[PDB]
Amino acid sequence: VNSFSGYLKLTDNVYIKNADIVEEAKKVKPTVVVNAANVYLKHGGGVAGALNKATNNAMQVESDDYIATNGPLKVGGSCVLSGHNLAKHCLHVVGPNVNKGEDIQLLKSAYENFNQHEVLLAPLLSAGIFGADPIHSLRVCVDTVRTNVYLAVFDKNLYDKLVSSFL
Ligand SMILES: C[C@@](O)(C(=O)O)c1ccccc1
């Protein structure tokens, strides 16, 4: 049993809810929240700017030190950093950004990072401002992630379309 509430069960291991991932993280304090990161860990907008804003910019300060030491992530890659006031850990995952011309086949590699964690609160990778098709991102998630993933979908209209269209 875990703390996640009000999710629709899609598969054995994937759950979905219309929710603000920031507000969900604040309530649950999950072991792992996933950030929709870029390779520079520059948290300006979407999931990254909002989580970063909710940490009072401490996520960005930590991230700048990580990049200064290690250099940029790979598209499809990840790193584990602090969850600050939101979670124990934040798994920063880089899905491909269609609005930068990145290979959508890298979305499966991105979701494979989730399999290193038994339970996660996450957004749909590559969806929203990353430019991919959200129905596609949910399909790749279901077909790639084997650990227990609780997906928060910000847009009520999109949530209803994802549920209604789910195979
Ligand atoms: C915040 C967001 O990235 C999400 O994860 O739901 C998002 C996706 C799609 C439309 C609006 C917002």
UniProtKB/Swiss-Prot annotation:
Residues 1-167 form the Macro domain. It is found in: Host endoplasmic reticulum membrane. It catalyses: Thiol-dependent hydrolysis of ester, thioester, amide, peptide and isopeptide bonds formed by the C-terminal Gly of ubiquitin (a 76-residue protein attached to proteins as an intracellular targeting signal). It is a multi-pass membrane protein. Responsible for the cleavages located at the N-terminus of the replicase polyprotein. Participates together with nsp4 in the assembly of virally-induced cytoplasmic double-membrane vesicles necessary for viral replication. Antagonizes innate immune induction of type I interferon by blocking the phosphorylation, dimerization and subsequent nuclear translocation of host IRF3. Also prevents host NF-kappa-B signaling. In addition, PL-PRO possesses a deubiquitinating/deISGylating activity and processes both 'Lys-48'- and 'Lys-63'-linked polyubiquitin chains from cellular substrates. May form homohexamers. Interacts with N protein. This is Papain-like protease nsp3. It comes from Severe acute respiratory syndrome coronavirus 2. The lineage of its organism: Viruses, Riboviria, Orthornavirae, Pisuviricota, Pisoniviricetes. The chain holds residues 1025 to 1191 of 7096 of the full protein.
